[PDB]
Amino acid sequence: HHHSLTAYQASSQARVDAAMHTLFTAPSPELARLYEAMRYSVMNGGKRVRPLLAYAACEALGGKPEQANGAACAVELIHAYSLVHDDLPAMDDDDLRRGQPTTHKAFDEACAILAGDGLQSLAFSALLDPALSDASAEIRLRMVTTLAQAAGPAGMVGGQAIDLGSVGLKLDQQALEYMHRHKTGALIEASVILGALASGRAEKGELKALQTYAQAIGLAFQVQDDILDVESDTATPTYPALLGLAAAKEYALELRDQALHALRPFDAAAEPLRELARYIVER
Amino acid sequence: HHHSLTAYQASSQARVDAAMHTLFTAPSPELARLYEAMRYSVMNGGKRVRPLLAYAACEALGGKPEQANGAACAVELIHAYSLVHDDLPAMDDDDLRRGQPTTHKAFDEACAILAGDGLQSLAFSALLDPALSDASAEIRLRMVTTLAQAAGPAGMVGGQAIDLGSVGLKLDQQALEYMHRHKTGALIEASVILGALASGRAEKGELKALQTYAQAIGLAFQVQDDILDVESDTATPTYPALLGLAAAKEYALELRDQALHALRPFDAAAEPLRELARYIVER
Ligand code: DMA
Ligand code: DMA
Ligand code: DMA
Numbered sequence: 263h264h265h266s267l268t269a270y271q272a273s274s275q276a277r278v279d280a281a282m283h284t285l286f287t288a289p290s291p292e293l294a295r296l297y298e299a300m301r302y303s304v305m306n307g308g309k310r311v312r313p314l315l316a317y318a319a320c321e322a323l324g325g326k327p328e329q330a331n332g333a334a335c336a337v338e339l340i341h342a343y344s345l346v347h348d349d350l351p352a353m354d355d356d357d358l359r360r361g362q363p364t365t366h367k368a369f370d371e372a373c374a375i376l377a378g379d380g381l382q383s384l385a386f387s388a389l390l391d392p393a394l395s396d397a398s399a400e401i402r403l404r405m406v407t408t409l410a411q412a413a414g415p416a417g418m419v420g421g422q423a424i425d426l427g428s429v430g431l432k433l434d435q436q437a438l439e440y441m442h443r444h445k446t447g448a449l450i451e452a453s454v455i456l457g458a459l460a461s462g463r464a465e466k467g468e469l470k471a472l473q474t475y476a477q478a479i480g481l482a483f484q485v486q487d488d489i490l491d492v493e494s495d496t497a498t499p500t501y502p503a504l505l506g507l508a509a510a511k512e513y514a515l516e517l518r519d520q521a522l523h524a525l526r527p528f529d530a531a532a533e534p535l536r537e538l539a540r541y542i543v544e545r
Numbered sequence: 546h547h548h549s550l551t552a553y554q555a556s557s558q559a560r561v562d563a564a565m566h567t568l569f570t571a572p573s574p575e576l577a578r579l580y581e582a583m584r585y586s587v588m589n590g591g592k593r594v595r596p597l598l599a600y601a602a603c604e605a606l607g608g609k610p611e612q613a614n615g616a617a618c619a620v621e622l623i624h625a626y627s628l629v630h631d632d633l634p635a636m637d638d639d640d641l642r643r644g645q646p647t648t649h650k651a652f653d654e655a656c657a658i659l660a661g662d663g664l665q666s667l668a669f670s671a672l673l674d675p676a677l678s679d680a681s682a683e684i685r686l687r688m689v690t691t692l693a694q695a696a697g698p699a700g701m702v703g704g705q706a707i708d709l710g711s712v713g714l715k716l717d718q719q720a721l722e723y724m725h726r727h728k729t730g731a732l733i734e735a736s737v738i739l740g741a742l743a744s745g746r747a748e749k750g751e752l753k754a755l756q757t758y759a760q761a762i763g764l765a766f767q768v769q770d771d772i773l774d775v776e777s778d779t780a781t782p783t784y785p786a787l788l789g790l791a792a793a794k795e796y797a798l799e800l801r802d803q804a805l806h807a808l809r810p811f812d813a814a815a816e817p818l819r820e821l822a823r824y825i826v827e828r
């Protein structure tokens with residue numbers, strides 16, 4: 263039972279969905295299909311957890327959540343574009359995502375490539391759109407810089423590349439964690455740091471804490487994902503294989519605890535971040 | 546005979562090549578192949594004309610050319626990433642570019658997808674890298690915003706999408722120009738506007754002139770490209786087909802003239818921009 267988190271997710275998804283709407287109107291008829299493809303790729307069925315994170319970090323520091331609209335859109339658009347390319351035939355070659363045809367299936371491969379390309383750019387536009395933030399010049403430099411680092415070849419793209427190059431190879435835990443830290447950790451950290459920055463009230467100490475929280479939940483998610491695949495398996499390169507199931511479950515709990523410890527400096531305004539940490543390993 | 550332009554191209558290419566070197570060192574062994582793929586994609590044999598444009602616009606306004614290093618890198622990296630995805634099997638399915646194997650041929654498709662993805666991000670990092678510019682907060686907001694608009698779905702990516710969706714269709718001149726304006730015009734304009742902005746001395750009037758120049762040379766290039774394909778054809782949807790060869794050649798001259806007219810407000814510091822305009826339609 264996680265009532266307030268369900269309500270927080272709902273408000274988070276509504277706010278970022280309405281914010282994004284303004285981004286996806288093609289400027290002309292010739293551009294309509296590309297914009298439709300991008301829209302399709304964002305209507306992917308996700309829970310907008312990265313926007314959730316942006317908004318929650320903003321409010322933890324005292325900002326109005328809408329101050330983080332630019333951040334929330336930007337991280338969701340980065341996340342969207344990553345999934346579209348990830349599904350491509352040359353990559354994971356998936357026909358479905360969350361029950362629906364993937365973008366290259368609903369459209370075609372060439373459209374899907376570009377839709378992903380278009381979405382990465384729009385993510386940066388969104389971050390700087392004055393309708394989406396009121397942030398000050400240097401804060402927004404911090405934010406833009408951050409997003410590019412987190413999404414690029416030393417971040418999420420790097421993580422995808424590590425994934426490809428790990429096909430075959432026998433990974434240990436340190437290598438598995440390195441790969442996850444890049445593939446999904448980076449953008450999760452960016453989510454919380456961008457949200458915090460967006461409040462205008464962010465101090466060095468507070469960002470450190472939030473980065474610690476974010477690193478912890480990013481790993482907890484991947485550990486629990488593996489645990490759930492195993493448990494669903496005994497229903498009808500992974501953490502359980504490396505550690506054994508029992509030990510994997512404890513690891514996930516220790517990470518949830520490290521995440522909650524990181525949030526000790528904050529007041530009740532940080533409760534959604536705390537409830538998410540709990541949910542990730544409870545789910 | 547275009548002696549000073551040859552020397553300008555040479556200095557332009559050396560400066561941006563040295564500037565980019567600092568970007569392409571992988572932070573770890575696991576990331577080496579991705580960074581190698583990106584490097585490969587930038588060592589594509591091009592003349593760095595977009596960097597040329599950035600540096601020339603900067604110097605036309607009185608800046609030291611290195612002030613535009615961030616701009617020059619960013620537009621070349623955007624240009625690089627566009628070619629890698631453009632060559633992909635789902636897109637143009639080219640095995641060679643300028644005589645060399647394309648990135649998906651030297652590496653594989655999945656690597657090439659990501660290399661293009663990584664390069665788009667690095668382009669934004671480069672633009673904000675303090676080693677590459679000294680520009681002030683609001684100027685650099687103008688620049689970042691500009692690059693995202695020019696490269697994204699209302700710009701170059703849009704142009705690629707128009708290209709795909711024009712397969713088949715019978716284009717008139719107005720539609721052909723609309724497609725070119727997006728596919729290559731946008732990023733050319735961005736090149737000159739980013740360079741100008743990078744000087745710190747850019748005024749509204751001067752940017753207008755440079756945008757006019759850039760729009761004109763962007764079209765002149767595409768018209769002359771078509772003319773050269775025809776002339777090489779009688780050696781051993783296009784402008785010549787739409788207009789006839791004779792008329793296409795005149796059109797290219799009228800565009801060169803519109804470009805040079807746009808530069809009337811500037812002194813001798815704008816000569817490289819003038820010599821490029823001449824070269825494009827003389828070549
Ligand atoms: C800790 C965290 C961000 C988990 C996100 O899971 P996901 O990537 O499947 O999220 P979404 O449902 O937003 O796609
Ligand atoms: C950054 C990114 C796209 C991660 C998805 O990785 P994956 O292919 O292992 O996960 P999924 O099951 O979502 O395809
Ligand atoms: C007017 C202009 C920018 C022409 C560029 O030609 P190109 O795209 O082939 O340039 P490069 O040789 O730099 O790839």
Ligand code: DMA
Nearest residue numbers: 627628631637701705728729
């Ligand atoms: C933005 C971009 C990649 C343009 C290249 O278009 P093209 O495929 O018509 O030209 P090329 O002959 O270089 O592939």
Ligand SMILES: [Cl-]
Nearest residue numbers: 287288294297
């Ligand atoms: Cl639309």
Ligand SMILES: [Cl-]
Nearest residue numbers: 570571577580
């Ligand atoms: Cl390297």
Ligand SMILES: [Mg+2]
Nearest residue numbers: 348353354425
């Ligand atoms: Mg994958």
Ligand SMILES: [Mg+2]
Nearest residue numbers: 348349354356
């Ligand atoms: Mg996948």
Ligand SMILES: [Mg+2]
Nearest residue numbers: 484487488500
């Ligand atoms: Mg897993």
Ligand SMILES: [Mg+2]
Nearest residue numbers: 631636637708
């Ligand atoms: Mg093409």
Ligand SMILES: [Mg+2]
Nearest residue numbers: 631632637639
């Ligand atoms: Mg091509």
Ligand SMILES: [Mg+2]
Nearest residue numbers: 767770771783
């Ligand atoms: Mg042509």
